[PDB]
Design a protein around this motif. Structure first.
Motif, short mmCIF file in Angstrom:
data_model
loop_
_atom_site.label_atom_id
_atom_site.label_comp_id
_atom_site.label_asym_id
_atom_site.label_seq_id
_atom_site.Cartn_x
_atom_site.Cartn_y
_atom_site.Cartn_z
N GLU A 198 2.11 1.72 -3.50
CA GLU A 198 1.06 2.24 -4.38
C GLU A 198 0.81 3.72 -4.09
O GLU A 198 0.63 4.50 -5.01
N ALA A 199 0.86 4.11 -2.81
CA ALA A 199 0.60 5.51 -2.46
C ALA A 199 1.74 6.39 -2.99
O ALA A 199 1.50 7.50 -3.49
N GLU B 166 0.85 -1.20 0.00
CA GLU B 166 0.00 0.00 0.00
C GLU B 166 0.88 1.25 0.00
O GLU B 166 0.57 2.23 -0.66
N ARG C 87 3.57 5.72 -5.62
CA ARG C 87 3.38 5.80 -7.07
C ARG C 87 2.30 6.81 -7.42
O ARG C 87 2.47 7.60 -8.34
N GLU C 88 1.19 6.82 -6.67
CA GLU C 88 0.11 7.77 -6.95
C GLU C 88 0.59 9.20 -6.71
O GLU C 88 0.26 10.12 -7.49
N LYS D 164 -3.61 7.10 1.33
CA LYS D 164 -2.95 6.28 0.33
C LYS D 164 -1.47 6.14 0.56
O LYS D 164 -0.99 5.03 0.50
N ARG D 165 -0.77 7.17 0.93
CA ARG D 165 0.69 7.17 1.14
C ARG D 165 0.98 6.35 2.30
O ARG D 165 1.95 5.57 2.21
N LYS E 280 -7.64 14.98 -1.18
CA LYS E 280 -6.98 14.43 -2.20
C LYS E 280 -5.93 14.41 -1.20
O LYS E 280 -5.75 13.43 -1.10
N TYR F 274 -3.59 17.96 -4.74
CA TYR F 274 -3.09 16.81 -3.97
C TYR F 274 -3.83 16.68 -2.46
O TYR F 274 -3.85 15.58 -1.86
N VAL G 153 -4.97 11.02 0.09
CA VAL G 153 -3.68 10.52 -0.48
C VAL G 153 -2.70 10.43 0.61
O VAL G 153 -1.88 9.58 0.51
N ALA H 26 2.67 10.22 -9.56
CA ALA H 26 1.83 10.44 -10.72
C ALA H 26 1.11 11.75 -10.68
O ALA H 26 0.96 12.37 -11.74
N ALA H 27 0.63 12.19 -9.49
CA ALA H 27 -0.14 13.46 -9.36
C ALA H 27 0.88 14.65 -9.33
O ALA H 27 0.68 15.70 -9.93
#
Length: 167
Positions: free
Chosen positions: A16-17, A13, A19-20, A150-151, A143, A140, A147, A23-24
């Protein structure tokens, strides 16, 4: 074994966070490279102007409420740009610090007619890059709240896996 599975899930996780977030950031990096290729000739020519243009004023009110300086005076802003650390602070603020009551109160203030990169580029060669960057922050939070969850998920998943192994 729940500690093992949760450690692996925390690692995945957090990856993935991250990477997101990267990406943003795909924008935050070129805003930041163009903010970085701005010749200093232009920022300088504009700080000195008599009155602020309406556009440059309104962007600047919120650039400043982010920075914790909740004051509407022009003078409060010239003050804040004067500093050269601002040339590095341009590349240091992160996004996790934003508060909920802040984004609540800024959001009424985003004046859509006024904010734009190419229009704002004729007013000035340098106004062009910042706009893009604020946006890479408002874009961000939640978000940023969502996020930061997510992070933590790659990040939160790694931490939870470690805590699970300890338990």
């Amino acid at each position: 074994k729940q500690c093992e599975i949760q450690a692996e899930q925390i690692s995945k996780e957090k990856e993935e966070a991250e990477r997101e977030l990267e990406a943003a950031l795909p924008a935050l990096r070129r805003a930041q490279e163009a903010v970085d290729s701005i010749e200093s000739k232009d920022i300088v020519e504009l700080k000195a102007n008599k009155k602020p243009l309406d556009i440059i004023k309104y962007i600047m009110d919120a650039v400043l409420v982010f920075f914790k300086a909740r004051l509407s005076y022009d003078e409060s802003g010239i003050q804040t740009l004067g500093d050269m650390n601002f040339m590095k602070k341009l590349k240091e603020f992160e996004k996790d610090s934003i508060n909920e009551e802040t984004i609540e109160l800024l959001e009424p203030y985003l004046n859509q007619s006024e904010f734009n990169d190419t229009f704002a580029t004729k007013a000035s060669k340098a106004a062009a890059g910042i706009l893009k960057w604020a946006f890479a922050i408002y874009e961000y939070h939640q978000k940023s709240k969502i996020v930061k969850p997510k992070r933590i998920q790659v990040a939160i998943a790694e931490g939870r896996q470690a805590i699970a192994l300890k338990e």
